Amino acid sequence: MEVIELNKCTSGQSFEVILKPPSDPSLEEIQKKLEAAEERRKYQEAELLKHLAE
Amino acid sequence: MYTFVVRDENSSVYAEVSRLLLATGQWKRLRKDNPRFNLMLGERNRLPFGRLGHEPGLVQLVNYYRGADKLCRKASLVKLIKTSPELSESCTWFPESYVIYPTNLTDEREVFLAAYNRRREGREGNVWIAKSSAGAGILISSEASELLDFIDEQGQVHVIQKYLEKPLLLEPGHRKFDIRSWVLVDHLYNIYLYREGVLRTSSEPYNSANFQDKTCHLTNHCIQKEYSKNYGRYEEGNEMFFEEFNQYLMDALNTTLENSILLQIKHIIRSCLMCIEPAISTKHLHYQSFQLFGFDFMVDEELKVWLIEVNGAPACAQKLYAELCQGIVDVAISSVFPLAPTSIFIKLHHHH
Amino acid sequence: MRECISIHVGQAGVQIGNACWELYCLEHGIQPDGQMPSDKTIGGGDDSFNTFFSETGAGKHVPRAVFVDLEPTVIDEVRTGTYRQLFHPEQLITGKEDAANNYARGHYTIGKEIIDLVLDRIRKLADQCTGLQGFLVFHSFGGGTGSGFTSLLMERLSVDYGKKSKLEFSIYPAPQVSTAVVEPYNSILTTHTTLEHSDCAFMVDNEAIYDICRRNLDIERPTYTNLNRLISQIVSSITASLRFDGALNVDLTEFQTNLVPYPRIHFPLATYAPVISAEKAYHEQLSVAEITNACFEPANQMVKCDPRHGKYMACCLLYRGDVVPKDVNAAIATIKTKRSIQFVDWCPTGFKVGINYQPPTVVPGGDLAKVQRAVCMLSNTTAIAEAWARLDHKFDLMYAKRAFVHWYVGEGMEEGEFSEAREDMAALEKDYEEVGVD
Amino acid sequence: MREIVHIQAGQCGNQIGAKFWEVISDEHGIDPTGSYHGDSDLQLERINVYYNEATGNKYVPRAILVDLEPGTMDSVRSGPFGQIFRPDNFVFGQSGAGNNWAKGHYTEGAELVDSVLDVVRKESESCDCLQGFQLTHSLGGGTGSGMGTLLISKIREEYPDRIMNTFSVMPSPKVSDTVVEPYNATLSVHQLVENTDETYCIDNEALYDICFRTLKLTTPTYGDLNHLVSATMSGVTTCLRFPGQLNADLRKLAVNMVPFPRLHFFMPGFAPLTQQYRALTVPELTQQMFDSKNMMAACDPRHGRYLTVAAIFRGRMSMKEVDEQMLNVQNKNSSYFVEWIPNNVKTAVCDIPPRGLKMSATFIGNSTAIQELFKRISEQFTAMFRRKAFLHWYTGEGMDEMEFTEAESNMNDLVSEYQQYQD
Ligand SMILES: Nc1nc2c(ncn2[C@@H]2O[C@H](COP(=O)(O)OP(=O)(O)OP(=O)(O)O)[C@@H](O)[C@H]2O)c(=O)[nH]1
Ligand SMILES: Nc1ncnc2c1ncn2[C@@H]1O[C@H](COP(=O)(O)OP(=O)(O)CP(=O)(O)O)[C@@H](O)[C@H]1O
Ligand SMILES: Nc1nc2c(ncn2[C@@H]2O[C@H](COP(=O)(O)OP(=O)(O)O)[C@@H](O)[C@H]2O)c(=O)[nH]1
Ligand SMILES: CN[C@@H](C)c1ccc(F)cc1
Ligand SMILES: [Ca+2]
Ligand SMILES: [Ca+2]
Ligand SMILES: [Ca+2]
Ligand SMILES: [Mg+2]
Ligand SMILES: [Mg+2]
Ligand SMILES: [Mg+2]
């Protein structure tokens, strides 16, 4: 039951009690993902229009 | 109309409780995966406790206490007793036990040998028994060499504890036995001891000069009905109930079952369950638990009672399924979900 | 001094952010017009509160905050609300139609068209900082914007501010206050893509906030305002160290250092006490021991789970009010002899304690009673994995039938991203089990 | 500003559509001349969803009235709120469609559809942010059925990413005008399966039974049936017309109701349906709302399972007691809710009740029991088609038998799709 690193100031204090010792994707890659999904949306809409044209 | 799901088809106890619940015409059984249940008769292993109590508007109850395995595992029970101040290492009603991991894997090997060498030197009885939860796999020997080598041949944790060389032997027969007590703990953590117990007796005369034949040393109902040639001779199914056992203690030892044995059993049950109550209590939890326990005791020739193990998913004696299963519904289920005596239990009062 | 930029995404994030900055102002003595009389340095200063507030020459104190929502009705509340004067228009970003509870729609379809704008507005705030620490990102799991656009924002932030910390305050979905069936889908999709980009995430389960409001505040049917005022008290407790003088959790990096030994396991459990109803005749004031002991009761945890059956990796006690270290150590000693507190063997069994003498501030006319002392415990338990299991299970039930999947595929997301995200959660569940179970 | 463009096509579509605007105009305080005379700001909060604002603070419905004969739309223009509609929004011909899907869809309708889309475009161009469209029509006639589904197809082509929503009256031999109604309904259903996001199935048989058995009307009329549709349309759109959170947007509603794209056909229900002054308790609202006798698709829900349910409660009541009763119905009958969609029952509350009611509840169910409705249609269709009976009315308009065979297959596929998820 030890207390360590007691820090005190006018607005409070902080300390530590020990009870027992122990025993990314680049900007380019993000644009591709975003554009790939947009391309799949476009391909799906084109197929819808192609179906409606028929 | 209350709803319940079944997730252990192999439970004879709750198969009857489920059969009773439906008979009341006020309980409905849902598919085992339907989450909108009031009551779960859960599986033995890996019961998904973390999914209980998150259904808006449903008070949910389960027939197992999360964490009670600490008491119902051979190795866990030993560790719990030795490390818990409430039970202490000097606990007088539990045989001297040690947790021994096979060498192919803390471990109490050296601690066990030290106490063993002491007994060997002091001319004392030095017979130990080795067992584990992964058994149907038991060995009784007076040589430490055989006990340790038998565990290495296996691959799971084991426990070596002192074998009760001076057991109480029923007469006629000169035969060993153990006492099974059923204990139901409800959601409020009341401890109810079923008034009916069973003595699972050995139909063979006890023989201390031959631990090789384990039919007169192991009182398991399966071993007696498979390897014992006098099965069913003295009592039906090697099962003596309290009425007969109490009468015997009166005719033979001029004492009563309550005075000589039952007080110790009730004391042991209380101690064990009160010890783990802070860890498994569901008092302030989002769901509620109850559980049926099977306590196993040994009685020595001094009328001292010893705890053998605790079973978390016990079966019952055929003759006592109706009474007990009804009692489970009365105090465990209907207390939380009431329906539109002379209790069969014995409430062991205690401080929460 | 180092600045912190708060980002509020979606309805949940924006309305929670509205409640926090309301509380922040009351705590620092800032009026709705931005004026702060106690600030004797007009138009500047590197005080602790300046980590969250910038200053104009006219003495206004402006939150370092950005509000983003793909639909304008929620942010229009800020523009005309009590604190409309705090923020300037550049800080409030709104689109015209939302993501419809569809992660793919917030992340891909709509996110792709507004991401650069949001980053530009954030860049403006960052340019006012002499030493930016990082970001605090508030959002929900279930919303299409909260889930879908946040993950896109977190990825870009890691690219534009590689060395900056990012903390999350995430709203875990609760059916009692949710009307979207697909929120398990969104929660898991956004956890997967955000996992490697967030240094520390504080999950708040609406089910827990809801029950605390009904149980302790006697609110029969709590509203978002009830839920959000309670949530901003916890957020305030967690961020007070950045806004006030102190030595514990004084910068964003210290949250990871103190609470997250393993990067993926960065979801501390938050526990708060006491929550007292203001409508009470008058409440007996709780002691340091009582409010500390309450930190180990499930009923006051931000996520319903059972820490008794997990393992702790770290533990911070954040006290506010009349609290001296003497009483703290006394309460802790008593709680160890009674509570089931198991730490992982590779971590010390201890507590980092922080005390701020200013007791909790409560919004006038709110639901919370003024108390003389309160505490918020931040503990990293494996028990919080229960919340992942509940969520992953609901995901599996629907995904086995591909229910609602067509909505996500229709927005340009591949079906494989579902299973990819699910397998990542399966790995997250395995990591918790390896750390907490024997 | 999430505007919806309303379209009503054909006789049934225009008569039911008319009553709809009469009902909701009252709820929002709009008088027959479009002047607002309400007393609650909640009325105007979302008024722009269905109304445009003209000079002088006039509110003009965003509705397009379509028909191939003038008769029914003259009745509207002469009806109670006839003057409230934009005069330019009346688009009609003189030929009629003779209860003939082919005439509405391929011949007579095709000649008129372009002028309808001109008005649709005009309304959409003035929308700040168009949500989508809602169409009221019947499937048993020629204009609403044939031209209506032609309109959806051409609207989808021009607004592919908006939500298409319909209130579709299904024919029944008990309330029948012509024997070809099964033909027209089967042809339309295939269109709807493809080109609508949400279709409220309104069965004239259910409406009849409710008027006869529950409402005790000795001789029900189309007017009586339409009173139930008006009340139902007002209930299901409450989430759109007042402030809310659950399904408060067409696309958000679709996201939570439609787990599979082709299974988007809903069973609506209303309560009360009435001792008419007695107060109605929250339990009674819930019991009735879920009662089959209160539903308008003539399908027994106990014959299938609910994929998703949306409930709306209107009036000043105990929201706590609402959650309790809703949770009581789910927990007391969870065998009728698929277990593989957690929390598929969502409840919303609105404080403004309908005219002349302390409180009410509207029910919206995506149930697999709806397959019973398509089975009835399919059976009647096949009974005639196997003998090619009455086919000449259709082949005389350029159609081939192959098109009927394909419509048949498509609806039987739909029924099979409902069956697999019911198991
Ligand atoms: N605690 C709390 N939860 C909220 C609040 N607002 C929404 N939620 C929760 O957030 C989830 C829905 O996500 P939203 O934030 O509303 O959706 P969104 O981020 O605006 O994204 P959209 O789909 O575009 O609307 C549900 O689980 C709600 O319970 C709030 O103000 N406070
Ligand atoms: N220390 C000991 N001394 C004497 N006998 C012992 C003993 N430990 C075990 N036994 C004997 O072993 C039998 C059962 O052992 P144990 O209970 O450990 O195995 P088990 O768990 O498979 C049977 P159950 O679970 O039904 O009680 C008892 O009947 C008892 O007679
Ligand atoms: N509920 C209701 N159904 C109607 C009404 N008018 C016609 N119907 C039904 O609609 C079908 C006839 O379609 P109708 O609208 O008259 O043909 P259309 O004008 O060519 O579209 C038949 O099934 C009728 O039972 C009405 O006012 N109310
Ligand atoms: C179909 N014939 C007309 C007269 C009719 C209308 C409504 C109704 F409920 C019953 C009959
Ligand atoms: Ca200053
Ligand atoms: Ca990073
Ligand atoms: Ca012509
Ligand atoms: Mg056993
Ligand atoms: Mg939103
Ligand atoms: Mg007609």
State the DSSP string of C345-412.
TTS-EEEEEEEESSPPP--TT-SBPP-SEEEEEEEEEGGGHHHHHHHHHHHHHHHTTTTTHHHHHTTT
Residue D140 in contact with residue A32, Cβ under 8 Å?
A: no
For chain B, where do the domains classified as CATH 3.30.470.20 start and end?
Answer: 69-70+168-348
* List of residues 6+ apart from C76 with CB closer than 8 A: C94
Instruction: Say which amino acid occupies B121.
Output: E
Q: Determine the Cα–Cα distance for residues B206 and B175; give it in Å rounded to an integer.
A: 5
Task: Report residues near ion ligand 6: CB below 5 Å.
Answer: C 158
The torsion angles phi and psi of C155, rounded to 5 degrees, stand at: -65, -50
Q: What is the CB-side half-sphere exposure of residue C132 using CA atoms within 13 A?
A: 22
Domains in chain D: boundaries: 1-259, 260-369, 370-423
Interatomic CA distance for residues C252 and C241, integer angstroms: 10
Rg of chain B over CA atoms, in angstroms? 21
Residue of D nearest to C72 (CA): D1
The candidate with the shortest Cα–Cα distance to C185, out of C402, C411, C435, C429, is: C402
B303: left (phi over 0), alpha (psi -120 to 50) or beta: left
Q: Which residue, chain included where needed, has tokens 């200053």?
A: C55
Q: Is the peptide bond before B172 cis (omega within 30 degrees of 0)?
A: yes
**Identity (one letter) of the amino acid at D44?**
L
Nearest in space to C21 (alpha carbons), one of C71, C99, C81, C95: C81
Residue C144: its H or E element: helix C144-144
State the distance from the centre of ligand 9 to the C-alpha of D343, rounded, in angstroms: 20
Ligand 1 in reach of C98 Cβ (< 6 A): yes
| DSSP label at residue D304 | S
Closest chain B CA to residue C385: B50
Instruction: Return d(Cα C205, Cα C187) in angstroms, integer.
Output: 12
Task: Show the CA angle centred on residue C49, arms to residues C43 and C52, nearest 5°.
Answer: 90
Other C-beta atoms closer than 10 Å to the C-beta of C89 total: 7
Distance, CA of A26 to CA of A16 (rounded, Å): 40
How far does CA C214 lie from the centroid of its chain?
A: 21
Beta strand C349-356 with C312-321 is parallel
With residues binned 3-state (H G I as helix, E B as strand, rest as coil), the percentages for chain D, rounded to 5, are 50, 20, 30
Rounded to the nearest 10°, the torsion over CA C193, C198, C202, C208 is 0
Q: Which residues pair with C378 in a beta bridge?
A: C270, C316
Beta bridge partners of B212: none
Instruction: Provide the residue type at C158 as one letter.
Output: S
CA dihedral of residues D54, D55, D56, D58 (deg, nearest 10) = -10
Q: What are phi and psi for residue D155, nearest 5 degrees?
A: -65, -45
Query: D121: Cβ–Cβ under 8 A, 6 or more apart, which residues?
Result: D158
Phi, psi for residue D31 in degrees, rounded to 5: -85, 175
CATH number, domain B2-68: 3.40.50.11480
What is the phi/psi pair of residue B229, to 5°?
A: -95, -10
- Nearest-atom number in ligand 2 for the CA of B74 is 18
- What is the H or E stretch that residue D8 is in? strand D2-9
Compute, in angstroms, the gap from residue C49 CA to the centroid of ligand 5: 9
Nearest 5°: phi and psi at D287? -55, -50
Cβ–ligand 2 distance for B308 under 6 Å, the answer yes
Q: What are phi and psi of C275, to 5 degrees?
A: -105, 110
What is the DSSP secondary structure assignment for residue C60, as one 8-state letter?
A: B
Hey, of D117, D153, D155, D157, which one would you mutate to test binding to chain A, going by the most A CBs within 10 A of its CB?
A: D157
Q: CA triplet B302, B304, B309: central angle to 5 degrees?
A: 140
Identify the three-state secondary structure at position C127: coil
3-class SS at D100?
Answer: coil
Question: How many A from CA of D256 to the centre of ligand 9?
Answer: 14
Method: X-ray
Helical H segments across D62-217, by residue range: 71-78, 101-105, 108-125, 148-158, 181-195, 204-209
Structure tokens at D242: 């007042």
Q: In this structure, which residue's CA is closest to atom 17 in ligand 3? A: D141
Q: Answer left, alpha or beta for residue D79, where phi above 0 means left and psi between -120 and 50 means alpha.
A: beta
Reduced to 3 states (helix: H, G, I; strand: E, B; else coil), residue D50 is coil
Identify whether the C-beta of residue C77 lies closer than 8 Å to the C-beta of residue C18. yes
On whether the CB atoms of residues C269 and C308 are closer than 8 A, the answer is no
The letter for the amino acid at B338 is: P
Query: Any binding-site annotation on C228?
Result: yes
Task: Output b/e per residue, C212-244; b: 16+ Cβ within 10 A.
Answer: bbbebbebebbebebbbbbbbbbbbbbbbbbbb
β-sheet bridge partners, residue D363? D269, D311
Q: Are C241 and C318 in contact (CB under 8 A)?
A: yes
Pairing mode, if any, of strands C65-69 and C92-94? parallel
**Cβ neighbours of C429 (radius 10 Å):** 15
The subunits that touch chain A, with at least 3 C-beta pairs less than 8 Å apart, are C, D
Residue D357, amino acid: L
State the DSSP H helix or E strand holding residue D267, giving kind and residue range, or none if neither: strand D265-271
Q: Could you tell me if B352 and B274 are in contact, meaning their C-beta atoms sit under 8 angstroms apart?
A: no
Number of Cβ atoms within 10 Å of the Cβ of C400: 9
3-class SS at D16? helix
Rounded-to-integer distance, Cα D110 and Cα D103, Å: 8
Other C-beta atoms closer than 10 Å to the C-beta of D301 total 23
Q: Which amino acid is at C94?
A: T
Distance, in Å, from the CA atom of C179 to the CA atom of C106, rounded to the nearest integer, reads 18
Where do we find the tokens 């709009």?
D30
- Supply D106's token pair: 């391929």
* Those residues with Cβ within 8 angstroms of residue D395's Cβ, 6 or more apart along the chain or in another chain: D401
Pick the catalytic residue from C207, C254, C386, C411.
Answer: C254
CA of C55 to the centre of ligand 5 (A): 7
- How would you classify the pairing of strands D306-315 and D265-271? unpaired
C255-258: long-range pairs with CB below 8 Å, 24+: C255/C165, C255/C167, C255/C199, C255/C200, C256/C165, C256/C199, C256/C200, C258/C314, C258/C316, C258/C352
From 3.30.470.20, 3.30.70.20, 3.30.70.100, 3.40.50.720, which CATH number describes the B69-70+168-348 domain?
3.30.470.20
Residue partners of D299: CB distance under 8 A and separation at least 6: D203, D267, D292, D367, D369, D370, D371, D372, D373
Q: Residue D64 is encoded by which pair of tokens?
A: 């397009």
Q: Rounded distance, CA B133 to CA B156, Å?
A: 9
Q: What torsion, rounded to 10 degrees, do the Cα atoms A39, A42, A47, A49 define? A: -170
Domain map (residue ranges) of chain C:
1-268, 269-383, 384-438
C303: tokens are 């996520």
Measured between alpha carbons, how far is C375 from C320 in angstroms, rounded to an integer?
Answer: 6
Residue that is written with structure tokens 């059956």 in the block = C309
**At B185, phi and psi to the nearest 5?**
-110, 125
Measured distance CA(D269)–CA(B250) in Å, rounded:
75
Query: Which residues in chain D precede a discontinuity of more than 2.5 Å between C and N?
Result: 274
Of C134, C150, C168, C164, the C-alpha closest to C4 is: C134
Report long-range pairs for B82-88 (Cβ below 8 Å, ≥24 apart).
B84/B275, B86/B271, B86/B274, B86/B275, B87/B271, B87/B272, B87/B275
Contacting subunits of C (3+ beta carbon pairs below 8 A):
A, B, D
- Residue B304 has which token pair? 């001292």
- Going by C-beta distance under 8 Å and a sequence separation of 6 or more, which residues neighbour residue B90? none
Buried b vs exposed e over B135-159: b needs ≥16 C-beta within 10 Å?
eeebbbbbebeebbebbeeeeebbb
B32 touches B20 (CB < 8 A): no
* Residues B74-93: b if buried by 16+ CB within 10 A, e if exposed: bbbbbbbbbebeebeeebeb
The answer to whether the CB of D407 falls within 8 A of the CB of D183 is: no
Neighbours of C75 (CB within 10 A): 22
* Nearest of C223, C259, C274 to residue C376 by alpha carbon: C274
Q: For residues C182 and C179, give the distance between their C-alpha atoms in angstroms, rounded to a whole number.
A: 9
CA-wise closest residue to B244 among B316, B196, B175, B297:
B196
Residues of B in contact with C207 (CB under 8 A): 54
Using a 10 angstrom Cβ sphere, with 0-12 exposed, 13-18 middle and 19 or more buried, the burial of residue B123 is: exposed
- Alpha carbons B296 and B9: distance in angstroms, whole number: 24
Pairwise CB contact (< 8 Å): A14 & C248 = yes
Residues of chain B with CATH 3.40.50.11480: 2-68
Cα gap B143→B129, rounded to integer Å: 10
> Is residue D199 within 8 Å of residue D137, measured between CB atoms?
no
B235 contacts B248 by C-beta, under 8 angstroms: no
Spatial strand order of the sheet with B158-162 comes to: B97-100, B158-162, B128-131, B139-141
Rg (CA), chain D: 20
Cis status of the peptide bond prior to C184, with omega within 30 of 0: no
**Six token digits for residue D250:** 């067409």
The partner residues of B201 in beta bridges, in order of sequence, read B177
Q: Which of D256, D339, D421 sits opposite C101 (nearest CB)?
A: D256
Evaluate the CA torsion angle C144, C146, C149, C152 in order and state its sign. Answer: negative
3-class DSSP string for chain B: CEEEEECCCCCHHHHHHHHHHHHCCCEEEECCCCCCCCEEECCCCCCCHHHCCCCCCCCCEECCCCCCHHHHCHHHHHHHHHHCCCCCCCCCCCCCEEEECCCCCCCCHHHHHHHHHHHHHCCCCCCEEEECCCCCCCEEECCHHHHHHHHHCCCCCEEEEECCCCECCECCCCECEEEEEEEEECCCCCEEEECCCEEEECCCCCCCCCCCCCCCCCCCHHHHHHHCCCCCCCCHHHEEEHHHHHHHHHHHHCCCHHHHHHHHHHHHHHHHHHHHHHHHCCCCCCCEECEEEEEEEEEECCCCEEEEEEECCCCCCHHHHHHHHHHHHHHHHCCCCCCCCCCCEEECCCCC
* C-alpha distance from residue D335 to each of B54, B152, D256, D301 (Å): 19, 53, 20, 11
Atom of ligand 4 nearest to the CA of D177: 1
Rounded (10°) angle between helices C115-126 and C150-160: 50
Number of DSSP helices (H) and strands (E) in chain A, helices first: 1, 2
Full DSSP string of C270-307: EEEE---BTTSS-PPPPPHHHHHHHTT-GGGBSS---G
Residues 6+ positions from C328 with CB-CB distance below 8 Å: A17, C288, C292, C317, C319, C353, C355
Q: How many CB atoms lie within 10 A of CB D279?
A: 7
Q: What crossing angle do the helices spanning C150-160 and A27-53 adopt, rounded to 10°? A: 140
Which among D361, D278, D365, D269 has a CA at the least distance from the CA of D317?
D361
Q: Do chains A and B touch (3 or more CB pairs under 8 A)?
A: no
Q: A42: Cβ–Cβ under 8 A, 6 or more apart, which residues?
A: none
Q: How far is CA C45 from the centre of its chain?
A: 27
Q: Say whether C155 is catalytic.
A: no
* Rounded Cα–Cα distance for residues C86 and C71 (Å): 21
